[PDB]
């Protein structure tokens, strides 16, 4: 491969301490990847959550790219979540299961 490619580093997390019951935001912060175009979507129990705004596409000193997604959801101790991320890579899209620990 000649076009210097860089694959994204994904993290999914709550903006504040997750206390299922009340509102907060679902964040998926993709960064460290390069080739601009990136498809990042949210998920709920398996489907595609919507009406999600994203950040002002900027980069790091290493000319790497970073984007942040976030939504207005109501945390519950039974609604499994994960981030949907696919971009110029090898394997199939990448889904990141949200976890209490991080």
């Amino acid at each position: 491969a000649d076009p210097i490619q860089r694959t994204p580093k994904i993290q999914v997390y709550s903006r504040h301490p997750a206390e299922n019951g009340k509102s907060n935001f679902l964040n998926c912060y993709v960064s460290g990847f390069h080739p601009s175009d990136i498809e990042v979507d949210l998920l709920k129990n398996g489907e595609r959550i919507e009406k999600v705004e994203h950040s002002d596409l900027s980069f790091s000193k290493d000319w790497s790219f970073y984007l942040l997604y976030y939504t207005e959801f109501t945390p519950t101790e039974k609604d499994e979540y994960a981030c949907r991320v696919n971009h110029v890579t090898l394997s199939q899209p990448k889904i990141v299961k949200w976890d209490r620990d991080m």
């Binding site: 076009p3 210097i4 860089r6 580093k9 993290q11 997390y13 903006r15 504040h16 301490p17 935001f25 964040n27 912060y29 960064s31 460290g32 390069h34 080739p35 601009s36 175009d37 002002d56 596409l57 900027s58 980069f59 000319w63 942040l68 976030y70 620990d101 991080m102």
Partner: protein, 260 residues
């Protein structure tokens, strides 16, 4: 305590769509203060900056836009300089900006470009300084390199609250049992602005810096960043592992322990 301002220009190529794609995020000491792109006529500045009635500062807008126009020809020229088929998406990332601090009268300016992720040999030495100006000589001309010391100081007085702050770290550890017999000690740090923060686990006075788990210090999304560093520890030795959470928005070393 050096403060700063940078603009990250980003432009892309689309396989024969005539007009390219692009943007221009701008920041100051880790806080976004400005913005611009195609199919946009103006610089939606930071809402948190309530400027007074008339926009007396747009010479930077002069700057950006032309950069928008010019953006094309560049991706154009860049494409022929290197043998590259106009059929493959291309991108040109550019970054200008500068630092600031009185004492030594600090004022260095960064101007760097990259083709498809490739530093572009600019002739001028890199981090160049800039604080002086001839006598009786207004330099109102097009350049941004001369409006740093000016435009930085401009952004830091129309929204001081969000740029003069220092939200310290709220840290706490957490125990999570390992079916393997070990226990992960996750030292969190939440709500802090000056992104540059460092957490660290020590074991009998010896930092375990290079042999612990660490996450790219991700963005709260509301105005600050979060970060947690962790370790695996013998079922028991817990109360022996400490978590030094440094940061200057905290006088002395914040130190944690936890377990249960």
């Amino acid at each position: 305590g050096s403060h700063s301002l940078r603009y990250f220009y980003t432009a892309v190529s689309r396989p024969g769509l005539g007009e390219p794609w692009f943007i221009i995020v701008g920041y100051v000491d880790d806080m976004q203060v400005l913005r611009f792109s195609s199919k946009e006529e103006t610089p939606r500045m930071a809402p948190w900056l309530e400027q007074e009635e008339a926009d007396n500062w747009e010479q930077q807008t002069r700057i950006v836009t032309i950069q928008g126009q010019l953006s094309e020809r560049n991706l154009m020229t860049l494409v022929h300089f290197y043998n590259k088929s106009m059929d493959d998406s291309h991108t040109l990332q550019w970054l200008q900006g500068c630092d600031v601090e009185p004492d030594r009268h600090l004022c260095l300016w960064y101007n760097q470009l990259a083709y498809d992720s490739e530093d572009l040999p600019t002739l001028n030495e890199n981090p160049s300084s800039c604080t002086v100006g001839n006598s009786t000589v207004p330099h109102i001309s097009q350049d941004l390199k001369s409006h740093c010391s000016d435009l930085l100081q401009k952004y830091l007085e129309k929204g001081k609250e969000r740029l003069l702050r220092s939200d310290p770290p709220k840290a706490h550890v957490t125990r999570h049992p390992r079916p393997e017999g070990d226990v992960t000690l996750r030292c969190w740090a939440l709500g802090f602005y000056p992104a540059d923060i460092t957490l660290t686990w020590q074991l009998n006075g010896e930092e375990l810096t290079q042999d612990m788990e660490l996450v790219e210090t991700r963005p709260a999304g509301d105005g600050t960043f979060q970060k947690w560093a962790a370790v695996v520890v013998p079922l028991g030795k817990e109360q022996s592992y400490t978590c030094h959470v440094y940061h200057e928005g905290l006088p002395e070393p914040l130190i944690l322990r936890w377990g249960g």
